[PDB]
Structure 1
Amino acid sequence: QYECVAEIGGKVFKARDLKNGGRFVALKRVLSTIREVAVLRHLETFEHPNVVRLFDVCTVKLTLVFEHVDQDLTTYLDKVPEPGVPTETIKDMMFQLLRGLDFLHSHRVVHRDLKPQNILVTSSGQIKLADFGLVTLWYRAPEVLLQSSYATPVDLWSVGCIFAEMFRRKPLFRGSSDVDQLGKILDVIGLPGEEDWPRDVALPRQAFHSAQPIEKFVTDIDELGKDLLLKCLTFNPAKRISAYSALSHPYF
């Protein structure tokens, strides 16, 4: 019922839904596991417009069948004609992003690895999150780098990072390792202040040595866009804005 036409990324393939007009699909071959798939199926019943459709789950290693989207945010940003993405297209794609995120969060599912490669862009220009529910550290939240907490704010830090990248069209924080990554981050937002530093991690606030204008790194950002971007990129997970309240920020 499926013919693998090409490999892409468990490992993701591009097949043809033989029983459904030969349309294209993305087959991923991959107790906790059983539970994770049950959640995926459960989330699918809500058929959210900003989450990739899960057309079916086959057994025999398990293969998940998703709708296939021709491109991701990276490809989209590679092809856009300078000066780049239209300010109103950024605003929209960001809203669609926050929309799917809040959906997942409302259901207590943390994406964990939100990055341009798994944020797909539809033929119609619709954002659809993928690769969740089952390396580059450029989108890792501070707390994850420090191995402190792992709640849902983690995904919002990633959103701030993607948001910046829609303007820059280049990653904001391009670290080479956990420590380098955390280093490049603090150069921008500045040292958090002992009060906001996890009290259980191995890396002391002392292992680093002041904040600077965000507009310097993200040119063309509005005042609202700048407010939102900073609320996302807040060092303390507890003080970081959520997707839900991000959907209500004046920026939108």
Structure 2
Amino acid sequence: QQYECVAEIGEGAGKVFKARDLKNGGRFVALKRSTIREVAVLRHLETFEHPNVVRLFDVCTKLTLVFEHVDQDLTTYLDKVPEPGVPTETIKDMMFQLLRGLDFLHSHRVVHRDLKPQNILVTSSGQIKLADFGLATLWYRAPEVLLQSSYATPVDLWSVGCIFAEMFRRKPLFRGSSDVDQLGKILDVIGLPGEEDWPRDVALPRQAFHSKSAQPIEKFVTDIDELGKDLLLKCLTFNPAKRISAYSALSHPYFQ
């Protein structure tokens, strides 16, 4: 064949294979098995070669997508990082890149929808690359998706908040086990929202939760400076309309 399989890196989405690219120097790639539209969109994004998204190298034809392989993801990086964890400035750098990648996507009307440490890739030189977007665990899901009310771009900024926190904590902020658990565990930290921030005509009303009050976020994210707290909270806003965008996030003072 033109590629040659070696491992599974691996499962979702659903399988991702590490493969030898025989034609191009035996380098490692990642092979992946409205369609030709999503594919078309993916090729159009490639034309911009944004440095914070995985490169698409080839499309073969049922459907095999050939992407850039990177040795680790954020999960494995947070695993192996020595105590006392990710340096403050490294967290700040990795966040900027994350939001850069995301804004690039959002600005080209692509919503990721499943951001998590497992498809945030971390290059040996420390470059952040987003993977596993543009094709078709609730700990990273936004409220509006749990509630099944809206699926616009803000959905991904909620996931960014969760990741930001986890870069400090080295463990997830919201480890729910069901949509309803997840929603519960979220409001336990951020508090019950105003009645007019609660989506209209969804199955779950505000009154299905008695998660009294907002607890100060630094109790859960020890290490976090004042500015990170501000940013993190603007990301973890209940109302998608009031949530900060990737674009505004790029200008937040936290990144001065």
* TM-score (ref. length: structure 2): 0.96
Taking the aligned partners of 2:66 and 2:218, their CA distance within structure 1 comes to: 42
Instruction: Give the superposition deviation at 1:193.
Output: 1.5
Taking the aligned partners of 2:192 and 2:76, their CA distance within structure 1 comes to: 34
Q: Which residue of 2 aligns with 1:21?
A: 25
Give CA-to-partner distance per residue, 1:19-48, whole Å, 9 cap, x none.
11100000001xx01100000000000000
List runs of 5+ in structure 1 lacking aligned partners.
none
Instruction: Give the superposition deviation at 1:64.
Output: 0.3
Taking the aligned partners of 1:10 and 1:227, their CA distance within structure 2 comes to: 36
Taking the aligned partners of 2:28 and 2:138, their CA distance within structure 1 comes to: 31
* Aligned partner of residue 28 in structure 2, secondary structure: strand
Taking the aligned partners of 2:208 and 2:68, their CA distance within structure 1 comes to: 46
Structure 1 segments of 4+ aligned residues over 4 angstroms from their partners = none
Taking the aligned partners of 1:4 and 1:213, their CA distance within structure 2 comes to: 48
Taking the aligned partners of 1:221 and 1:201, their CA distance within structure 2 comes to: 35
Q: Which residue of 2 aligns with 1:71?
A: 72
Give CA-to-partner distance per residue, 1:115-166, whole Å, 9 cap, x none.
0000000111100000000090000000000000000000000000000000
The alpha-carbon distance between structure 1 residues 109 and 135, as it changes in their structure 2 partners (threshold 3 A), is closer
Instruction: Give the superposition deviation at 1:87.
Output: 0.2
Taking the aligned partners of 1:177 and 1:140, their CA distance within structure 2 comes to: 11
Instruction: Give the superposition deviation at 1:10.
Output: 2.7
Taking the aligned partners of 1:198 and 1:179, their CA distance within structure 2 comes to: 15
Give CA-to-partner distance per residue, 1:52-80, whole Å, 9 cap, x none.
00000000x10000010010000000000
The alpha-carbon distance between structure 1 residues 202 and 135, as it changes in their structure 2 partners (threshold 3 A), is farther
The alpha-carbon distance between structure 1 residues 27 and 151, as it changes in their structure 2 partners (threshold 3 A), is same
Give CA-to-partner distance per residue, 1:195-239, whole Å, 9 cap, x none.
100002100100001101000000011111000000000000000
Taking the aligned partners of 1:28 and 1:135, their CA distance within structure 2 comes to: 12
Taking the aligned partners of 1:6 and 1:93, their CA distance within structure 2 comes to: 27
* TM-score (ref. length: structure 1): 0.98
Corresponding residue pairs, total: 249
* Aligned partner of residue 239 in structure 1, secondary structure: coil
Farther-moved stretch of structure 1 (225-234 vs 11-20): 11-20
* Aligned partner of residue 172 in structure 2, secondary structure: coil
The alpha-carbon distance between structure 1 residues 90 and 135, as it changes in their structure 2 partners (threshold 3 A), is farther
List runs of 5+ in structure 2 lacking aligned partners.
none
Instruction: Give the superposition deviation at 1:180.
Output: 0.2
Instruction: Give the superposition deviation at 1:6.
Output: 1.2
Taking the aligned partners of 2:37 and 2:150, their CA distance within structure 1 comes to: 22
Taking the aligned partners of 2:70 and 2:223, their CA distance within structure 1 comes to: 29
Taking the aligned partners of 1:117 and 1:52, their CA distance within structure 2 comes to: 13
Taking the aligned partners of 2:95 and 2:69, their CA distance within structure 1 comes to: 21
Taking the aligned partners of 2:31 and 2:169, their CA distance within structure 1 comes to: 33
* Aligned partner of residue 211 in structure 1, secondary structure: coil
Taking the aligned partners of 2:68 and 2:233, their CA distance within structure 1 comes to: 34
The alpha-carbon distance between structure 1 residues 220 and 135, as it changes in their structure 2 partners (threshold 3 A), is farther
* Aligned partner of residue 82 in structure 1, secondary structure: coil
Q: Which residue of 2 aligns with 1:87?
A: 88
Aligned identity (percent) is 99
Give CA-to-partner distance per residue, 1:168-208, whole Å, 9 cap, x none.
00000000100000000000000001110000210010000
